[PDB]
Amino acid sequence: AILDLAKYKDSKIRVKLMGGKLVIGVLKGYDQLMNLVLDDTVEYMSISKNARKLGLTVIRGTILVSLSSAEGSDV
Amino acid sequence: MLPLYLLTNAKGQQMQIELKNGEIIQGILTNVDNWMNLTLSNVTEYSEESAINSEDNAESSKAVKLNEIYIRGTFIKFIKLQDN
Amino acid sequence: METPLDLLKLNLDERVYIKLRGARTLVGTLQAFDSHCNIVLSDAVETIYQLNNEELSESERRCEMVFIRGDTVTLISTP
Amino acid sequence: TAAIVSSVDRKIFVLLRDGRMLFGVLRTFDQYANLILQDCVERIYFSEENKYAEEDRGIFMIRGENVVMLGEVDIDKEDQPLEAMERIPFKEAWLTKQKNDEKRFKEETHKGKKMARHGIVYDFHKSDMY
Amino acid sequence: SVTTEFLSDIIGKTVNVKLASGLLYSGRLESIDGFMNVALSSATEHYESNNNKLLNKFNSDVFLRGTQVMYISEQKI
Amino acid sequence: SENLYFQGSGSLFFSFFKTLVDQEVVVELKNDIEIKGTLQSVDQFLNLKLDNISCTDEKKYPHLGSVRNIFIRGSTVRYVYLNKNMVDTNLLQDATRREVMTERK
Amino acid sequence: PEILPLEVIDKTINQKVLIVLQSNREFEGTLVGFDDFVNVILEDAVEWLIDPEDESRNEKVMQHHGRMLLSGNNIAILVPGGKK
């Protein structure tokens, strides 16, 4: 396919979801349909005060709108 | 599959993608698939709101840089392609 | 078994009640429908629900023959 | 499931789901109404104040689900109404427009919350700003 | 096919059908299809909970769009 | 026995609209704008091409006098108002039964 | 071995699970089973409406009895072990 998730294995990723939610966690595994297993998952809802810890989770590949590393640079 | 075909010719080129929520992703197209999912490199992410506000410079340039990003085709609104 | 489509065709040529997204309801005579819930209604009567300053209000329009796009439909029943 | 890819060249307007008006040259489209536009222009009108604004957008690929309507236009003819109008900067107009969108959205969430207390669902789409 | 087997043995039973809008329908399930379109007999309409104000009681079958269905559950109460 | 509103399994409303070509209709959109015009075309997704239009103008949107024909995205339509004159309701009810025969599969 | 999303969900059958939707709503219950499209069968589900700002001002909409079928249409997140 198009994004090799293997390169992101065991690092923190950032994942946007269709209804506004953002989820950050360590990528543990994934499948061809881009369902993901994330650990130490934090879920932000639609700012920072809005954080819930969920721990180990499964995100549906179907509602995923973007994925990137959690590492990034401001301005 | 018209969009998929044109983009696969635009690999290596820079573009400005706006998402359904108004987020703008500018980057280098590195890959496209049959459903119009995209991976870009060298990416800079900002809103239409910020890009319009920085026109007569105020609160300059509030953006975010990423090494790589995966974008879901069905979440794309439009794509500004390079002038050439 | 009778599928929900089979049961709905039992209402063909009868008065139906349809609920739409956006606080609107219709009543009319059911002429057609597909599996996507596009619908043709005859002698329909629309009813729009509005808020006059935090108070519930309604108004109505009437029409002969009307196509209704399925993706707006929330329920079908009888008047 | 063959793609019917039409090559054309017309001057059109496009209205998008987000409420923006584009003017440009349509070159390509498929049966899903995916469009490739050339020499695009984003134009905002405020006929209620005799003001308008333009800004260049270049080459646009537009996904069809984001389209509300489009139609062939005569550019020269649509100029004439502009001639009697005051052109303002795009940023100012965009900001005005965002102000109006905000008002609509807040009025629509208010309506949805009130009607819910009466049981009525105002199913409402945040994307439908047109 | 745990999902189809579940649907199989609630045909004819009284259920609760909650929509995405949060509207809640209770009554007897006459039919359901693969897309989860539903027909219900003796249907009541409540918002969110059965314990809330009765909004509508229906006297013929009510048809509900599978695309809007959030859940279907056994009624036991 | 052949119904013009029924051309095969999935095309009921597609066949229905092709029958309304060259008729004056009124299309109302989800945003409330109403557009009177002559149906010139329809496709399998029920997108509409109206010829010779007239619109109910809006504070939001400019009148564009040079526009004679618009494409309308099917998913943006709420209602299409017609005349009873335009449709054989016997064939429509029949076609629906033919579609129901197929769609239950 | 590799960790697989569908495999994780399977190992959760007969465990508590928290199903989070795209909207602000979640269901905690015992996972009975699911299908290919991740339609989920839950037993004696608690239904919560969730406040974005305060996890304390969350609202229990209902305690369900019996089994429910929850459509995978709206399913964003599955958390094995539940709310905890």
UniProtKB/Swiss-Prot annotation, chain C:
Cellular location(s): Nucleus; Nucleus, Nucleolus; Cytoplasm
Reported impact of residue 21 to E: Sensitive to thermal stress. Decreases binding affinity for U6 snRNA
SMART domains reported for this sequence: Sm
Outcome of substituting residue 38 to A: Strongly reduces affinity for poly-U RNA ends
Gene Ontology terms describing biological process: deadenylation-dependent decapping of nuclear-transcribed mRNA; mRNA splicing, via spliceosome; P-body assembly; rRNA processing; tRNA processing
PROSITE patterns: SM
Record's keyword annotation contains tRNA processing: yes
Signal peptide per UniProt: none
GO molecular function, one term: RNA binding
Keywords assigned: Cytoplasm, mRNA processing, mRNA splicing, Nucleus, Ribonucleoprotein, RNA-binding, rRNA processing, Spliceosome, tRNA processing
Cited InterPro entries: Lsm3, LSM_dom_sf, Sm, Sm-like_LSM3, Sm_dom_euk/arc
Residue ranges occupied by any Sm domain in the UniProt entry: 3-79
One family name in Pfam for this protein: LSM
GO cellular component terms attached to this protein's record: catalytic step 2 spliceosome; cytoplasm; Lsm1-7-Pat1 complex; nucleolus; nucleus; P-body; precatalytic spliceosome; sno(s)RNA-containing ribonucleoprotein complex
Family statement drawn from the similarity comment of this UniProt entry: Belongs to the snRNP Sm proteins family.
Role played: Component of LSm protein complexes, which are involved in RNA processing and may function in a chaperone-like manner. Component of the cytoplasmic LSM1-LSM7 complex which is involved in mRNA degradation by activating the decapping step. Together with PAT1, the LSM1-LSM7 complex binds to osmotic stress-activated mRNAs to attenuate the osmotic stress response, probably by limiting ribosome access to the mRNA and consequently translation. Component of the nuclear LSM2-LSM8 complex, which is involved in spliceosome assembly.
UniProtKB/Swiss-Prot annotation, chain D:
One Gene Ontology term of the molecular function aspect: chromatin binding
Cellular component annotations (GO), alphabetically ordered: cytoplasm; Lsm1-7-Pat1 complex; nucleus; P-body; ribonucleoprotein complex
Signal peptide (residue range): none
Subcellular compartments: Nucleus; Cytoplasm; Cytoplasm, P-body
Segments forming a coiled coil: none
Keyword Nucleus: yes
Phenotype when the gene is knocked out: Increases the level of stress-responsive gene mRNA during osmotic stress.
Family: Belongs to the snRNP Sm proteins family.
Biological role: Component of the cytoplasmic LSM1-LSM7 complex which is involved in mRNA degradation by activating the decapping step. Together with PAT1, the LSM1-LSM7 complex binds to osmotic stress-activated mRNAs to attenuate the osmotic stress response, probably by limiting ribosome access to the mRNA and consequently translation.
UniProt protein name: LSM1-LSM7 complex subunit LSM1
UniProt organism field: Saccharomyces cerevisiae (strain ATCC 204508 / S288c)
Residues of the full protein shown: 43 to 172 of 172
Swiss-Prot record, chain E:
Disulfides per UniProt: none
Compartments it resides in: Cytoplasm; Nucleus, Nucleolus
InterPro entries: Lsm6/sSmF (IPR016487), LSM_dom_sf (IPR010920), Sm (IPR047575), Sm_dom_euk/arc (IPR001163)
Pfam families found in the cross-reference section: LSM (PF01423)
Keywords assigned: Cytoplasm, mRNA processing, mRNA splicing, Nucleus, Ribonucleoprotein, RNA-binding, rRNA processing, Spliceosome, tRNA processing
One GO term (biological process): maturation of SSU-rRNA
Entry GO MF terms: RNA binding
SMART domains recorded: Sm (SM00651)
One Gene Ontology cellular component: nucleolus
SUPFAM superfamilies: Sm-like ribonucleoproteins
Domain Sm residues, every copy: 2-77
Record note on quaternary structure: Component of the heptameric LSM1-LSM7 complex that forms a seven-membered ring structure with a donut shape. The LSm subunits are arranged in the order LSM1, LSM2, LSM3, LSM6, LSM5, LSM7 and LSM4. Except for LSM1, where a C-terminal helix crosses the ring structure to form additional interactions with LSM3 and LSM6, each subunit interacts only with its two neighboring subunits. The LSM1-LSM7 complex interacts with PAT1; within the complex PAT1 has direct interactions with LSM2 and LSM3. The LSM1-LSM7 complex interacts with XRN1.
Similarity comment: family membership: Belongs to the snRNP Sm proteins family. SmF/LSm6 subfamily.
Record-given protein name: LSM complex subunit LSM6
Organism: Saccharomyces cerevisiae (strain ATCC 204508 / S288c) (Baker's yeast)
Lineage: Eukaryota, Fungi, Dikarya, Ascomycota, Saccharomycotina
UniProtKB/Swiss-Prot annotation, chain F:
Effect of residue 47 to A: Strongly reduces affinity for poly-U RNA ends
Pfam families reported for this sequence: LSM
UniProt cross-references to CDD domains, sorted A to Z: LSm2
Gene Ontology cellular-component annotations: catalytic step 2 spliceosome; cytoplasm; Lsm1-7-Pat1 complex; nucleolus; nucleus; P-body; precatalytic spliceosome; sno(s)RNA-containing ribonucleoprotein complex
UniProtKB keywords: Cytoplasm, mRNA processing, mRNA splicing, Nucleus, Ribonucleoprotein, RNA-binding, rRNA processing, Spliceosome, tRNA processing
Gene Ontology process terms (BP): deadenylation-dependent decapping of nuclear-transcribed mRNA; mRNA splicing, via spliceosome; rRNA processing; tRNA processing
InterPro entries linked: LSM_dom_sf, Sm, Sm_dom_euk/arc, U6_snRNA_Lsm2
Function: Component of LSm protein complexes, which are involved in RNA processing and may function in a chaperone-like manner. Component of the cytoplasmic LSM1-LSM7 complex which is involved in mRNA degradation by activating the decapping step. Together with PAT1, the LSM1-LSM7 complex binds to osmotic stress-activated mRNAs to attenuate the osmotic stress response, probably by limiting ribosome access to the mRNA and consequently translation. Component of the nuclear LSM2-LSM8 complex, which is involved in spliceosome assembly.
Protein name as catalogued: LSM complex subunit LSM2
Organism: Saccharomyces cerevisiae (strain ATCC 204508 / S288c)
